[PDB]
Scaffold this active site. Structure first.
Site, PDB file in Angstrom:
ATOM      1  CB  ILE A   1     -31.569  64.448  89.996  1.00 34.00           C
ATOM      2  CG1 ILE A   1     -30.240  63.668  90.067  1.00 34.00           C
ATOM      3  CG2 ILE A   1     -31.772  65.083  88.616  1.00 34.00           C
ATOM      4  CD1 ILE A   1     -30.317  62.358  89.187  1.00 34.00           C
TER       5      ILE A   1
ATOM      6  CG  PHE B   1     -25.966  60.080  80.889  1.00 36.10           C
ATOM      7  CD1 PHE B   1     -25.772  61.172  81.770  1.00 36.10           C
ATOM      8  CD2 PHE B   1     -26.587  58.948  81.394  1.00 36.10           C
ATOM      9  CE1 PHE B   1     -26.152  61.072  83.067  1.00 36.10           C
ATOM     10  CE2 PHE B   1     -26.987  58.871  82.703  1.00 36.10           C
ATOM     11  CZ  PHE B   1     -26.751  59.938  83.577  1.00 36.10           C
ATOM     12  CG  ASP B   2     -21.604  64.265  82.094  1.00 34.65           C
ATOM     13  OD1 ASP B   2     -20.583  64.507  81.421  1.00 34.65           O
ATOM     14  OD2 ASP B   2     -22.111  65.111  82.891  1.00 34.65           O
TER      15      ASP B   2
ATOM     16  CG  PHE C   1     -25.460  59.168  88.547  1.00 30.35           C
ATOM     17  CD1 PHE C   1     -24.715  60.083  87.831  1.00 30.35           C
ATOM     18  CD2 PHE C   1     -26.854  59.230  88.494  1.00 30.35           C
ATOM     19  CE1 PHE C   1     -25.359  61.040  87.049  1.00 30.35           C
ATOM     20  CE2 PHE C   1     -27.487  60.180  87.719  1.00 30.35           C
ATOM     21  CZ  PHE C   1     -26.762  61.068  87.030  1.00 30.35           C
TER      22      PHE C   1
ATOM     23  CE1 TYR D   1     -21.670  63.233  86.067  1.00 33.80           C
ATOM     24  CE2 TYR D   1     -20.588  64.845  87.456  1.00 33.80           C
ATOM     25  CZ  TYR D   1     -21.303  64.532  86.295  1.00 33.80           C
ATOM     26  OH  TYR D   1     -21.622  65.546  85.419  1.00 33.80           O
TER      27      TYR D   1
ATOM     28  CE1 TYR E   1     -32.015  66.074  85.177  1.00 30.44           C
ATOM     29  CE2 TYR E   1     -31.105  63.858  84.912  1.00 30.44           C
ATOM     30  CZ  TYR E   1     -30.945  65.223  85.187  1.00 30.44           C
ATOM     31  OH  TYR E   1     -29.714  65.705  85.549  1.00 30.44           O
TER      32      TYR E   1
HETATM   33  C1  LIG Z   1     -22.780  71.290  81.193  1.00 30.17           C
HETATM   34  O1  LIG Z   1     -23.043  70.150  82.033  1.00 30.17           O
HETATM   35  C2  LIG Z   1     -23.993  70.435  83.050  1.00 30.17           C
HETATM   36  C3  LIG Z   1     -24.350  69.123  83.735  1.00 30.17           C
HETATM   37  C4  LIG Z   1     -24.876  68.019  82.826  1.00 30.17           C
HETATM   38  C5  LIG Z   1     -26.245  68.398  82.277  1.00 30.17           C
HETATM   39  C6  LIG Z   1     -26.969  67.186  81.675  1.00 30.17           C
HETATM   40  C7  LIG Z   1     -26.991  66.010  82.660  1.00 30.17           C
HETATM   41  C8  LIG Z   1     -27.629  64.782  82.028  1.00 30.17           C
HETATM   42  C9  LIG Z   1     -25.563  65.736  83.182  1.00 30.17           C
HETATM   43  O2  LIG Z   1     -24.731  65.235  82.142  1.00 30.17           O
HETATM   44  O3  LIG Z   1     -25.002  66.924  83.727  1.00 30.17           O
HETATM   45  C10 LIG Z   1     -25.526  64.749  84.342  1.00 30.17           C
HETATM   46  O4  LIG Z   1     -24.666  63.859  84.395  1.00 30.17           O
HETATM   47  C11 LIG Z   1     -26.504  64.819  85.434  1.00 30.17           C
HETATM   48  O5  LIG Z   1     -27.536  64.220  85.256  1.00 30.17           O
HETATM   49  N1  LIG Z   1     -26.168  65.546  86.528  1.00 30.17           N
HETATM   50  C12 LIG Z   1     -24.917  66.281  86.748  1.00 30.17           C
HETATM   51  C13 LIG Z   1     -24.223  65.779  88.042  1.00 30.17           C
HETATM   52  C14 LIG Z   1     -25.158  65.919  89.202  1.00 30.17           C
HETATM   53  C15 LIG Z   1     -26.404  65.105  88.932  1.00 30.17           C
HETATM   54  C16 LIG Z   1     -27.130  65.533  87.640  1.00 30.17           C
HETATM   55  C17 LIG Z   1     -27.865  66.829  87.897  1.00 30.17           C
HETATM   56  O6  LIG Z   1     -28.657  66.964  88.778  1.00 30.17           O
HETATM   57  O7  LIG Z   1     -27.572  67.850  86.978  1.00 30.17           O
HETATM   58  C18 LIG Z   1     -28.310  69.069  87.133  1.00 30.17           C
HETATM   59  C19 LIG Z   1     -29.543  69.016  86.267  1.00 30.17           C
HETATM   60  C20 LIG Z   1     -29.225  68.893  84.758  1.00 30.17           C
HETATM   61  C21 LIG Z   1     -30.479  70.221  86.403  1.00 30.17           C
HETATM   62  C22 LIG Z   1     -31.023  70.487  87.824  1.00 30.17           C
HETATM   63  C23 LIG Z   1     -31.723  69.273  88.440  1.00 30.17           C
HETATM   64  C24 LIG Z   1     -32.329  69.625  89.792  1.00 30.17           C
HETATM   65  C25 LIG Z   1     -33.330  70.783  89.667  1.00 30.17           C
HETATM   66  O8  LIG Z   1     -33.875  71.083  90.974  1.00 30.17           O
HETATM   67  C26 LIG Z   1     -32.634  72.003  89.069  1.00 30.17           C
HETATM   68  O9  LIG Z   1     -33.624  73.050  88.910  1.00 30.17           O
HETATM   69  C27 LIG Z   1     -33.052  74.343  88.610  1.00 30.17           C
HETATM   70  C28 LIG Z   1     -32.024  71.651  87.715  1.00 30.17           C
HETATM   71  C29 LIG Z   1     -27.341  70.169  86.722  1.00 30.17           C
HETATM   72  C30 LIG Z   1     -26.350  70.581  87.810  1.00 30.17           C
HETATM   73  O10 LIG Z   1     -25.933  69.738  88.594  1.00 30.17           O
HETATM   74  C31 LIG Z   1     -25.915  72.028  87.868  1.00 30.17           C
HETATM   75  C32 LIG Z   1     -24.568  72.195  88.600  1.00 30.17           C
HETATM   76  C33 LIG Z   1     -27.014  72.756  88.600  1.00 30.17           C
HETATM   77  C34 LIG Z   1     -27.961  73.563  88.108  1.00 30.17           C
HETATM   78  C35 LIG Z   1     -28.069  73.894  86.642  1.00 30.17           C
HETATM   79  C36 LIG Z   1     -29.009  74.166  88.983  1.00 30.17           C
HETATM   80  O11 LIG Z   1     -29.019  73.629  90.308  1.00 30.17           O
HETATM   81  C37 LIG Z   1     -28.891  75.682  89.114  1.00 30.17           C
HETATM   82  O12 LIG Z   1     -30.157  76.078  89.600  1.00 30.17           O
HETATM   83  C38 LIG Z   1     -30.515  77.402  89.226  1.00 30.17           C
HETATM   84  C39 LIG Z   1     -27.810  76.111  90.054  1.00 30.17           C
HETATM   85  O13 LIG Z   1     -28.080  76.446  91.191  1.00 30.17           O
HETATM   86  C40 LIG Z   1     -26.389  76.139  89.552  1.00 30.17           C
HETATM   87  C41 LIG Z   1     -25.362  75.829  90.655  1.00 30.17           C
HETATM   88  C42 LIG Z   1     -26.163  77.503  88.908  1.00 30.17           C
HETATM   89  C43 LIG Z   1     -24.976  77.602  87.926  1.00 30.17           C
HETATM   90  C44 LIG Z   1     -24.885  79.028  87.384  1.00 30.17           C
HETATM   91  C45 LIG Z   1     -25.190  76.628  86.793  1.00 30.17           C
HETATM   92  C46 LIG Z   1     -24.349  75.640  86.502  1.00 30.17           C
HETATM   93  C47 LIG Z   1     -24.660  74.702  85.418  1.00 30.17           C
HETATM   94  C48 LIG Z   1     -23.886  73.619  85.291  1.00 30.17           C
HETATM   95  C49 LIG Z   1     -24.206  72.581  84.284  1.00 30.17           C
HETATM   96  C50 LIG Z   1     -23.484  71.464  84.074  1.00 30.17           C
HETATM   97  C51 LIG Z   1     -22.128  71.252  84.723  1.00 30.17           C
END
Ligand SMILES: CO[C@H]1C[C@@H]2CC[C@@H](C)[C@@](O)(O2)C(=O)C(=O)N2CCCC[C@H]2C(=O)O[C@H]([C@H](C)C[C@@H]2CC[C@@H](O)[C@H](OC)C2)CC(=O)[C@H](C)/C=C(\C)[C@@H](O)[C@@H](OC)C(=O)[C@H](C)C[C@H](C)/C=C/C=C/C=C/1C
Lengths: 121, 96
Positions: free
Chosen positions: A68, A48-49, A111, A38, A94
């Protein structure tokens, strides 16, 4: 705005364009593990990513709120191999809190998503 | 015996929770309160077959993630924390 409204409320919150047709009949099901590449951009076209900076496909479980809302809605409509563009209103992204520093309050996001694969778990 | 948690479970549960605090609740302080004891436990070293495998597979990545967090403490640059989370995610997606 350009694209087809794919929201269940038909509120134009998530608008989809198909950039490359995929190969299924099948779209991923709730809970499937989904693998994508993506790119994310703000409404002014600023990137942004990009998934490629992590050197492997991005993986998440569909329909669990891990991502999201626009993604849970959009990816559920895709076939394997498809590339689509999603325009995502803030209510499906967001919202008022943003994702600072890169994503401000009340931001519409763009996206491009390539659906590589999906499996049952 | 059976109730004593081991590296893999502690990191799986802990990364989940730290990520909810940071990405869900915008709570960097809370995130660090979860991550710091997890890195501190790695210092005692693997005490089981499962822990040694885990440490061989993931130890370097986690130590790098801690380096990026320590840099964030000095820089305040969120890109440094993003680097750490790319590593935590890389580990989490393989243990889960
Ligand atoms: C370093 O880069 C980040 C991703 C960056 C952060 C900032 C944003 C601009 C961005 O650049 O991604 C981006 O492009 C974006 O907007 N994304 C990522 C691609 C999917 C769509 C979107 C998104 O929803 O991100 C997500 C967004 C930022 C936050 C979530 C949005 C939905 C909301 O319901 C959630 O509440 C919790 C929070 C981040 C993610 O896709 C990651 C994978 C998922 C989570 C963190 C949560 O679901 C968490 O909940 C406990 C989990 O169950 C996960 C699997 C647990 C494990 C340990 C954590 C993994 C963390 C991985 C973090 C990663 C790779």
């Amino acid at each position: 705005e350009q694209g087809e409204d794919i929201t269940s409320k038909k509120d134009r919150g998530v608008l989809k364009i198909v950039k490359r047709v995929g190969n299924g009949e099948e779209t991923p099901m709730i809970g499937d593990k989904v693998y994508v590449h993506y790119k994310g951009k703000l409404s002014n076209g600023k990137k942004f990513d990009s998934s490629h900076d992590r050197n492997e496909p991005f993986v998440f479980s569909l329909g669990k709120g891990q991502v999201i809302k626009a993604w849970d809605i959009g990816v559920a409509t895709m076939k394997k191999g498809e590339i689509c563009h999603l325009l995502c209103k803030p209510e499906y992204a967001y919202g008022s809190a943003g994702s600072l520093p890169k994503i401000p309050s009340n931001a519409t996001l763009f996206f491009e998503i390539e659906l590589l694969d999906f499996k049952g778990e | 015996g059976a109730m004593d948690p081991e590296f893999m479970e502690m990191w799986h549960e802990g990364l989940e929770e730290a990520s909810r605090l940071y990405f869900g609740e915008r709570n960097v302080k809370g995130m660090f309160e979860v991550l710091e004891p997890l890195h501190a436990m790695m210092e005692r070293g693997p005490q089981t077959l499962k822990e040694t495998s885990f440490n061989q597979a993931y130890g370097r990545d986690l130590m790098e993630a801690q380096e990026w967090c320590r840099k964030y403490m000095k820089s305040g640059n969120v890109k440094d924390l993003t680097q750490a989370w790319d590593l935590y995610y890389h580990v989490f997606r393989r243990i889960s």
